[PDB]
């Protein structure tokens, strides 16, 4: 029934029923006065763009341009959109990004696990991040000191050879050749077999 | 829809392999360990007091 979240070092776990984001925003807007609360200047600049049109002003109820306060509806919609950025309801994803990320990380991480309880479940893998991440950080640092950057060295990350005409995440199985050459982690993985 | 124990068994596979001699050191044979075995889930304890 309850949900417990205790990420803080010095604070006990919070106790809420469901929909933690919406519950937190509603409780903080209801139990205490939210008029004095002002968000960052980024939200203030977004407020000008939202106010400049009548339909958007009606939708978001943003009446005062100079006021630094942000209404509950705008924040809730922004949070919902940010959550929706990854998952698309059009097609059912087989597995979440965390599953594939854990697989790709633990494919390297298998060597140390043989000295400990072999994990047959994801939860045991999740329970060993503090003991596993330092190895990944060390090898990432070593690769950073090792790469010569045969690809364009403007930035060192993934998904850089995307075709300018293509503007969709899903393949149109088919992969354009050389799409992921610029990533350095895939280079390290291929080097390691 | 759920899979049988056989398919997840075959997928999970084995990862260890050890060689053990008999008491007299007459014969040597290997043992296999399956990661999906119920033996792992039981969490039994072990000791060898002298």
């Amino acid at each position: 029934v309850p949900s417990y979240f205790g990420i803080t070092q010095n604070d006990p776990f919070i106790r809420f029923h469901t929909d933690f984001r919406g519950e937190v925003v509603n409780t903080m807007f209801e139990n205490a006065s939210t008029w004095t609360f002002s968000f960052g200047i980024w939200y203030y600049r977004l407020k000008r763009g939202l106010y400049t049109q009548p339909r958007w002003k009606r939708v978001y109820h943003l009446a005062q341009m100079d006021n630094f306060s942000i209404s509950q509806e705008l924040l809730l919609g922004v949070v919902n959109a940010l959550e929706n950025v990854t998952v698309y309801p059009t097609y059912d994803c087989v597995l979440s990004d965390l599953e594939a990320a854990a697989c790709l990380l633990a494919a390297y991480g298998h060597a140390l696990w043989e000295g400990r309880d072999p994990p047959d479940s994801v939860a045991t893998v999740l329970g060993e991040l503090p003991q596993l991440l330092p190895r990944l950080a060390d090898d990432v640092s070593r690769e950073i000191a090792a790469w010569e950057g045969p690809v364009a060295a403007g930035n060192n990350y993934y998904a850089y050879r995307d075709s300018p005409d293509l503007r969709y995440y899903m393949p149109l199985r088919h992969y354009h050749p050389g799409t992921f050459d610029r990533h350095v982690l895939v280079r390290l993985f291929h080097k390691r077999g | 829809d759920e899979v049988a124990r056989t398919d997840e068994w075959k997928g999970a596979g084995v990862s260890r392999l050890r060689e053990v001699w008999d008491v007299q050191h007459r014969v040597r044979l290997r043992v296999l360990w399956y990661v999906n075995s119920f033996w792992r889930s039981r969490e039994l304890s072990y000791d060898d007091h002298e």
Binding site: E114, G115, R116, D117, P118 | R16, R18, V20, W21, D22, V23, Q24, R26, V27, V31, W33, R40, E43, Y46, D48
Partner: peptide, 27 residues
């Protein structure tokens, strides 16, 4: 123990500490 049709047999003994020397030590 291994048994063959003619009744002959051969056998030998193990110590559990040798079989489980490291697999159980992890758990």
């Amino acid at each position: 123990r291994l048994v063959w049709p003619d009744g002959s047999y051969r056998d030998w003994e193990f110590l559990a500490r040798d079989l489980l020397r490291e697999e159980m030590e992890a758990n």
